[PDB]
Amino acid sequence: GIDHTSKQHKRSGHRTAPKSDNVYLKLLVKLYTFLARRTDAPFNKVVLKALFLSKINRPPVSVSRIARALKQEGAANKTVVVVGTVTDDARIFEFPKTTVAALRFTAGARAKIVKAGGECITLDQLAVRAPKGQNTLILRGPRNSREAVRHFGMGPHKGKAPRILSTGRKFERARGRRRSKGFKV
Amino acid sequence: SAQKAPKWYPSEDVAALKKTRKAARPQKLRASLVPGTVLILLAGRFRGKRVVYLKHLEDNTLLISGPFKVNGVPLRRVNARYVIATSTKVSVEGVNVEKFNVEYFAKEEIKAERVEDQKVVDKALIAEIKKTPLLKQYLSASFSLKNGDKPHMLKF
Amino acid sequence: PSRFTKTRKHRGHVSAGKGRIGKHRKHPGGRGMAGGQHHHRINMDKYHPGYFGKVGMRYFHKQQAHFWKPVLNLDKLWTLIPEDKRDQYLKSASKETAPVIDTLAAGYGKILGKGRIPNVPVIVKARFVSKLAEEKIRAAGGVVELIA
Amino acid sequence: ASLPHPKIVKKHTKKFKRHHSDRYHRVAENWRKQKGIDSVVRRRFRGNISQPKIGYGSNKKTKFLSPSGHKTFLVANVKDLETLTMHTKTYAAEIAHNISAKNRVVILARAKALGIKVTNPKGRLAL
RNA sequence: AAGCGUGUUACCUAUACUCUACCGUCAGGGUUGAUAUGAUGCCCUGACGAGUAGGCAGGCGUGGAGGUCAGUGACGAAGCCUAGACCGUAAGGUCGGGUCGAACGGCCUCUAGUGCAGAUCUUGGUGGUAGUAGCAAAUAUUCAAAUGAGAACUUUGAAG
RNA sequence: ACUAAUCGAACCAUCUAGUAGCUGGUUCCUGCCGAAGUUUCCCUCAGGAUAGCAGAAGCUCGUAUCAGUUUUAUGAGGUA
RNA sequence: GACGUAAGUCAAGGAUGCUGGCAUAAUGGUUAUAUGCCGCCCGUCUUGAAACACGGACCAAGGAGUCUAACGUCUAUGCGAGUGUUUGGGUGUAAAACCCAUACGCGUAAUGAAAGUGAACGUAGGUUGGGGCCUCGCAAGAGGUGCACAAUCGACCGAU
RNA sequence: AAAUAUUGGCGAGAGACCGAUAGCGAACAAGUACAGUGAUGGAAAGAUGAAAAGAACUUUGAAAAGAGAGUGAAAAAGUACGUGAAAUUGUUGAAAGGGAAGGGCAUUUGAUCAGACAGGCCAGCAUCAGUUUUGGUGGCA
Ligand SMILES: [Mg+2]
Ligand SMILES: [Mg+2]
Ligand SMILES: [Mg+2]
Ligand SMILES: [Mg+2]
Ligand SMILES: [Mg+2]
Ligand SMILES: [Mg+2]
Ligand SMILES: [Mg+2]
Ligand SMILES: [Mg+2]
Ligand SMILES: [Mg+2]
Ligand SMILES: [Mg+2]
Ligand SMILES: [Mg+2]
Ligand SMILES: [Mg+2]
Ligand SMILES: [Mg+2]
Ligand SMILES: [Mg+2]
Ligand SMILES: [Mg+2]
Ligand SMILES: [Mg+2]
Ligand SMILES: [Mg+2]
Ligand SMILES: [Mg+2]
Ligand SMILES: [Mg+2]
Ligand SMILES: [Mg+2]
Ligand SMILES: [Mg+2]
Ligand SMILES: [Mg+2]
Ligand SMILES: [Mg+2]
Ligand SMILES: [Mg+2]
Ligand SMILES: [Mg+2]
Ligand SMILES: [Mg+2]
Ligand SMILES: [Mg+2]
Ligand SMILES: [Mg+2]
Ligand SMILES: [Mg+2]
Ligand SMILES: [Mg+2]
Ligand SMILES: [Mg+2]
Ligand SMILES: [Mg+2]
Ligand SMILES: [Mg+2]
Ligand SMILES: [Mg+2]
Ligand SMILES: [Mg+2]
Ligand SMILES: [Mg+2]
Ligand SMILES: [Mg+2]
Ligand SMILES: [Mg+2]
Ligand SMILES: [Mg+2]
Ligand SMILES: [Mg+2]
Ligand SMILES: [Mg+2]
């Protein structure tokens, strides 16, 4: 017998592969597995782990988010890398001429980047031209901005959204939510 | 198809053995096993017969001939672990023994030259036996364990 | 599909994952929303505060078509122009030829001022506007035209 | 013969019969795991039957090997048999149970000419 | 003393400890200029393995469905029987013999009225009990002949 | 008491698969992890909700804010 | 690593060498039996079951978490500030497949009981961390930039 | 009037439905047989063979029937009819049995059975490596 200090036979709790059965994503994982192992560049290990993520773990990255990151000092000429979907954003009116490598582009995002003078490439093209991720800038979309995150941590005084179907008056704006009706939160 | 197929197949390559480091070194015999010693055969056809040890052959066997005229055991090999080395010894520095080796006893009526080799070694061996009294009777008699014999305490 | 369900894995096991002590019953706590004030009160106050009681004044015979007023922010205001036509207005930010945007035909009631439109004059036909949305349209050289 | 293989250790040569399968006819010999609260077999009391577990798993170097060193591949015709043309030292063909007598004659003569071992070269013969 | 108190050794044996092998699990890694084509593959290293209620995972089996094997079969399909053989830790799979007579499988997927020892479960069938308990209220039967394969019991005669 | 072997409210059919916090049963294998009978509230005490214990999915990172342990220093306590 | 001047040898990152018998029921497997030791009847409720608790005489077949409306979390897929062809219409090899307009649902705006109002002082802020990237470095590191995310102080919108 | 409804009636076409304890209660002389005063309740029950070719004829028996013979691809299909399981039973053979029987580990005995000659089976010895056990003796503090 052994006085076990930790739980035995514990899985790491991290994805070692994508749950997706997309054959082309498996080829991207196959390419970046080799790069993460045959290079010491930390960029390849980050990209390989990002290729495993689920859909909510890779939120879309706006072209406006891409353009704001290119306003950083000394970042005006870097290859923006988005392991996920790059969406369009009409609220911006000045996009720069830069190169974006992404897993997926929307039709509007591809049009806006190309029209500005830039170029849209895939992750395998990124690997050929930047094997160690030279002059790259990984961008991640907002993960806690999901609508399900609103209801996480519900409870008194927590200030979270209740899980509700119909909103308005007569739907949870009474006893428990105001001092004139019993108590508040 | 009754059974579909193996999706890929295992290679039928016969891999070579790794280089083993087991060098063959010569056997060390017991100090009690010296040429001329009288031995008691513990098994085989000649169970319990007293024989004369002559030479240590290259297959690690013992070359013995407890004289054929004395007890009927001819020139032959015995395993060292299947004999008991007694304290009785006969002087054998007069016996032509170099002619016998592993190739002499290769199995494949009696061969004519084998009885002649026996008739030469016994003459030079029986002559030494007749010096010390009663060894001819000792070598013609078979060893046996009797009621009250404790081999763990018997000093042969 | 049925073959992927835990019911298939519970075959051979006595209680089907419901326990030997608990002994899965019909309706142990009542049916539906039973006991929301009595034995399910803690769950109600924790996760649905405001459920019990009354809130403000009633509205007999409410027609939601009265209150139809889709809001549009200024950052999406230029999306009402088709994109091929849009660029030649962004260039030459000039009066005497300014795009006329009927926000009603696009299905909007009130123009709001989230802001930062380009510096191009724009003619906005809106049923309603916020004060700040009016300030930013006039700052760009345009004007808000009230319609009905 | 076949490829050289290590000595095959079965690790449990006895069938894992179900508890009380000799007591009652209605209980089949097919293994089922006792799930009773008081079950002595489930509780692993001394003197009771051994339940199957992963410790009895065969060596992967000799798992699925027949005593002759071949893995068995079930064949139903000449085309199925000729799959094993280059794999005669790792695989022995076994003719399917529903193969007619005349077709077994053709399969055996083809397997003899290709040097393929046949596990059951005696089914449906005039002997 | 083979009892009690105390002391000294030797000895016995747990699924415990040490070493090794094998299985599985977990972790950390290696592996692409023919890896000398399985990259959820091959391989290296280390640790670990009790379990009700319960959770998850990988698989076995059944009815039907799309595809494929130009799969099996009246020269015998399916079924059933078989202290005959083989494979799998197992769910099970495969084969030989007998019986039989018309359909039935492997693989990739789809789908469910999909797996039984229990529910005083349902329906049907069969046991031990067991040639047993019993066939004992109503007073009562007997003889001969006939008929018949066969008469305690039918018919007739006689008697009671 | 009797009211067709039915009577402290007959029988038949339907509503009706009436409800049941209660009893019984709940059907293949292997692998890994692995409990609770405790908190608060309830016409609550054979029940439930809640928190706790447990599994699964993981995510962000890569040796740390750490620890059912001690030491050093400084508090607190009113039991033997 | 060891020995040897060296070649080379070795017990140094896991057994080799020599010899005999049999080549079949000899070893082995399966089965029946015998012997040594062990082994209480399962399922169930229970703190506790072999129980003098309950169900079960036997066998075959049937037999129990399903479907639907709405929904939470998670995952896969398509598209993406949009999305959803299938109410309908067109078409058809005809309940299939293929094509499509206008609406509508949800989302893109909130807040207030309501009348209403309605989201940039700033490089969409400041501070502390933060993967990755860039520059200088043999490296250790230093500096710059710092997405997601965490904490905090602000700013804006609605209510008071 | 039309677009709407339709577990009844009539006529059709279908099915990732059920396949004789299932599917309607009813695949069949089924709302039948039967039960109840009545209202009502309400089953079980499909399959020889391609064709009856449904066994002429002989023999034993009172007869049923048996034994032959014959028909048939088959009578291991004989209307007690496709196949023909289990419970339970008869015969034969084998085994064991002092107040249960059954089972686990191991082996004896009996029975039965698979494969291999271009290494298969069981062993013996020597020199080593790993893990141990039991001795003998030496030199030091
Ligand atoms: Mg369980
Ligand atoms: Mg059960
Ligand atoms: Mg239960
Ligand atoms: Mg109350
Ligand atoms: Mg086995
Ligand atoms: Mg217990
Ligand atoms: Mg004693
Ligand atoms: Mg376990
Ligand atoms: Mg079905
Ligand atoms: Mg058949
Ligand atoms: Mg037929
Ligand atoms: Mg069912
Ligand atoms: Mg049953
Ligand atoms: Mg009697
Ligand atoms: Mg009488
Ligand atoms: Mg009444
Ligand atoms: Mg019910
Ligand atoms: Mg009821
Ligand atoms: Mg555990
Ligand atoms: Mg936990
Ligand atoms: Mg006190
Ligand atoms: Mg005992
Ligand atoms: Mg109870
Ligand atoms: Mg009790
Ligand atoms: Mg019990
Ligand atoms: Mg009870
Ligand atoms: Mg009973
Ligand atoms: Mg019963
Ligand atoms: Mg069944
Ligand atoms: Mg369609
Ligand atoms: Mg709505
Ligand atoms: Mg029926
Ligand atoms: Mg009557
Ligand atoms: Mg029938
Ligand atoms: Mg037949
Ligand atoms: Mg038959
Ligand atoms: Mg027949
Ligand atoms: Mg029959
Ligand atoms: Mg039987
Ligand atoms: Mg026994
Ligand atoms: Mg035996």
Coordinates of N, CA and C in Angstrom, one line a residue, chain C residues 23-93:
Chain C
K23 N -34.1 5.6 -4.6 CA -35.1 4.6 -5.1 C -36.1 5.4 -5.9
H24 N -35.7 5.8 -7.1 CA -36.3 6.8 -8.0 C -37.8 6.7 -8.0
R25 N -38.5 7.8 -7.6 CA -39.9 7.8 -7.3 C -40.6 8.7 -8.3
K26 N -41.9 8.9 -8.1 CA -42.7 9.6 -9.1 C -42.5 11.1 -9.1
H27 N -42.8 11.7 -8.0 CA -42.6 13.2 -7.8 C -42.3 13.5 -6.4
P28 N -41.1 13.2 -5.9 CA -40.8 13.3 -4.5 C -40.9 14.7 -3.9
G29 N -40.7 15.8 -4.7 CA -40.8 17.1 -4.2 C -42.0 17.9 -4.7
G30 N -43.0 17.2 -5.2 CA -44.1 17.8 -5.9 C -43.9 18.0 -7.4
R31 N -45.0 18.5 -8.1 CA -44.9 18.6 -9.5 C -44.8 20.1 -9.9
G32 N -44.0 20.3 -11.0 CA -43.9 21.7 -11.5 C -43.2 22.6 -10.6
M33 N -43.8 23.8 -10.4 CA -43.3 24.8 -9.5 C -43.8 24.8 -8.1
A34 N -44.1 23.5 -7.6 CA -44.7 23.4 -6.3 C -43.7 23.8 -5.2
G35 N -44.3 24.4 -4.2 CA -43.5 24.8 -3.0 C -42.5 25.9 -3.2
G36 N -42.7 26.8 -4.2 CA -41.7 27.9 -4.4 C -41.5 28.8 -3.3
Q37 N -42.5 28.9 -2.4 CA -42.4 29.7 -1.2 C -42.2 28.8 0.1
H38 N -42.3 27.5 0.0 CA -42.2 26.7 1.2 C -41.0 25.8 1.2
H39 N -40.9 24.8 0.3 CA -39.7 23.9 0.4 C -38.7 24.0 -0.7
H40 N -39.0 24.9 -1.7 CA -38.1 25.2 -2.7 C -37.7 26.7 -2.7
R41 N -37.9 27.3 -1.5 CA -37.7 28.8 -1.3 C -36.3 29.2 -1.5
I42 N -35.3 28.4 -1.0 CA -33.9 28.8 -1.1 C -33.5 28.8 -2.6
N43 N -33.9 27.8 -3.4 CA -33.6 27.8 -4.8 C -34.2 29.0 -5.5
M44 N -35.4 29.4 -5.1 CA -36.0 30.6 -5.7 C -35.3 31.9 -5.4
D45 N -35.0 32.1 -4.2 CA -34.3 33.4 -3.8 C -32.9 33.4 -4.3
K46 N -32.2 32.3 -4.5 CA -30.9 32.3 -5.0 C -30.8 32.5 -6.5
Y47 N -31.7 31.9 -7.2 CA -31.5 31.9 -8.7 C -32.6 32.6 -9.4
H48 N -33.8 32.9 -8.8 CA -34.8 33.7 -9.4 C -35.3 34.7 -8.4
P49 N -34.5 35.7 -8.0 CA -35.0 36.8 -7.1 C -36.0 37.6 -7.9
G50 N -37.0 38.1 -7.3 CA -38.0 38.9 -8.0 C -39.2 38.1 -8.5
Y51 N -39.2 36.7 -8.3 CA -40.2 35.9 -8.9 C -41.6 36.2 -8.3
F52 N -41.7 36.2 -7.0 CA -43.0 36.3 -6.3 C -43.3 37.8 -6.1
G53 N -44.6 38.1 -6.1 CA -45.0 39.5 -5.9 C -45.4 40.2 -7.2
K54 N -45.7 41.5 -7.0 CA -46.1 42.4 -8.1 C -45.2 43.5 -8.3
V55 N -45.2 44.1 -9.5 CA -44.3 45.1 -9.9 C -45.3 46.2 -10.4
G56 N -44.9 47.2 -11.2 CA -45.7 48.3 -11.5 C -47.0 48.2 -12.2
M57 N -47.5 49.3 -12.8 CA -48.8 49.4 -13.3 C -49.1 48.5 -14.5
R58 N -50.3 48.0 -14.6 CA -50.8 47.2 -15.6 C -51.0 48.0 -16.9
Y59 N -51.2 47.2 -18.0 CA -51.5 47.8 -19.3 C -52.5 46.9 -20.0
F60 N -53.8 47.4 -19.9 CA -54.8 46.6 -20.6 C -54.7 46.8 -22.1
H61 N -54.7 45.7 -22.9 CA -54.7 45.6 -24.3 C -53.4 46.4 -24.9
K62 N -52.3 45.7 -24.6 CA -51.0 46.3 -25.1 C -50.8 45.8 -26.5
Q63 N -50.5 46.8 -27.4 CA -50.2 46.5 -28.8 C -48.7 46.9 -29.0
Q64 N -47.9 45.8 -29.2 CA -46.4 46.0 -29.3 C -46.1 46.9 -30.5
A65 N -47.0 46.9 -31.5 CA -46.7 47.7 -32.7 C -46.7 49.2 -32.4
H66 N -47.3 49.7 -31.3 CA -47.2 51.0 -30.8 C -45.8 51.4 -30.5
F67 N -45.1 50.5 -29.8 CA -43.8 50.7 -29.3 C -42.6 50.3 -30.2
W68 N -43.0 49.9 -31.4 CA -41.9 49.6 -32.4 C -41.0 50.8 -32.7
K69 N -39.8 50.7 -32.4 CA -38.8 51.7 -32.6 C -37.4 51.1 -32.5
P70 N -37.0 50.4 -33.6 CA -35.6 49.8 -33.6 C -34.6 50.9 -33.6
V71 N -33.6 50.7 -32.8 CA -32.5 51.8 -32.6 C -31.4 51.4 -33.5
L72 N -30.7 52.5 -34.0 CA -29.6 52.3 -34.9 C -28.5 53.3 -34.4
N73 N -27.3 52.8 -34.2 CA -26.2 53.6 -33.7 C -25.5 54.3 -34.9
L74 N -24.7 55.3 -34.5 CA -24.0 56.0 -35.6 C -22.9 55.2 -36.2
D75 N -22.3 54.3 -35.5 CA -21.2 53.5 -36.1 C -21.8 52.5 -37.2
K76 N -23.0 52.2 -37.2 CA -23.7 51.4 -38.2 C -24.5 52.2 -39.2
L77 N -24.4 53.6 -39.1 CA -25.2 54.4 -39.9 C -24.8 54.3 -41.4
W78 N -23.5 54.2 -41.7 CA -23.0 54.1 -43.0 C -23.2 52.7 -43.7
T79 N -23.7 51.7 -42.9 CA -24.0 50.5 -43.5 C -25.3 50.5 -44.3
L80 N -26.1 51.6 -44.2 CA -27.4 51.6 -44.9 C -27.2 51.9 -46.4
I81 N -26.0 52.4 -46.7 CA -25.6 52.6 -48.1 C -25.0 51.3 -48.6
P82 N -25.3 50.9 -49.8 CA -24.6 49.7 -50.4 C -23.1 50.0 -50.5
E83 N -22.3 48.9 -50.3 CA -20.9 49.1 -50.1 C -20.1 49.6 -51.4
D84 N -20.6 49.2 -52.6 CA -20.0 49.7 -53.8 C -20.2 51.2 -54.0
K85 N -21.4 51.7 -53.6 CA -21.8 53.1 -53.6 C -21.1 53.9 -52.5
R86 N -20.7 53.2 -51.4 CA -20.3 53.8 -50.2 C -19.0 54.5 -50.3
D87 N -18.1 54.0 -51.1 CA -16.7 54.5 -51.1 C -16.6 55.9 -51.8
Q88 N -17.4 56.1 -52.8 CA -17.3 57.4 -53.5 C -17.9 58.5 -52.7
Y89 N -18.7 58.2 -51.7 CA -19.2 59.2 -50.7 C -18.2 59.5 -49.6
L90 N -17.4 58.4 -49.2 CA -16.4 58.6 -48.2 C -15.3 59.5 -48.7
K91 N -14.9 59.3 -50.0 CA -14.1 60.3 -50.7 C -15.0 61.5 -51.1
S92 N -14.3 62.6 -51.1 CA -15.0 63.9 -51.4 C -16.1 64.2 -50.4
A93 N -15.7 64.4 -49.1 CA -16.6 64.7 -48.1 C -17.1 66.1 -48.3

